[PDB]
């Protein structure tokens, strides 16, 4: 059920220690990574227009 991600937790065999944690700011790295991936096509297309107009 942790592999199913129904709640926050993780098991243990050697020590049996239970740890519960979460990462609230999920909407930051998604929008940032999408801006990087979308801007890659912008810079590459710019290099296509300039590479086309030069050589």
């Amino acid at each position: 059920m942790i592999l199913d991600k129904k709640f926050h937790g993780i098991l243990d065999q050697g020590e049996g220690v239970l740890i519960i944690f979460d990462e609230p700011p999920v909407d930051k790295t998604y929008e940032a990574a999408l801006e990087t991936i979308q801007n890659m096509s912008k810079v590459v297309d710019s290099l296509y227009n300039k590479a086309k107009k030069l050589t």
């Binding site: 929008e31 999408l34 801006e35 979308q38 801007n39 096509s41 912008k42 297309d45 296509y48 227009n49």
Partner: protein, 57 residues
């Protein structure tokens, strides 16, 4: 979200800019608005030194 909401059209801009290159038909500049977004984003940079002063002394 507004930045990406304009970049989704800026993905289509290099096609028209790669076809016609003559004349401008869209009254939107897509530049000064993002400059203003950067100006609102620089508040973190300008106030980071303020937090450095409040934490320092």
């Amino acid at each position: 979200n507004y930045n990406k909401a304009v970049e989704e059209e800026d993905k289509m801009t290099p096609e028209q800019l790669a076809i016609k290159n003559v004349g401008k038909q869209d009254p939107k500049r897509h530049l000064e608005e993002h400059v203003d977004v950067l100006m609102t984003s620089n508040i973190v940079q300008c106030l980071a030194a303020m937090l450095d002063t409040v934490v320092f002394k």
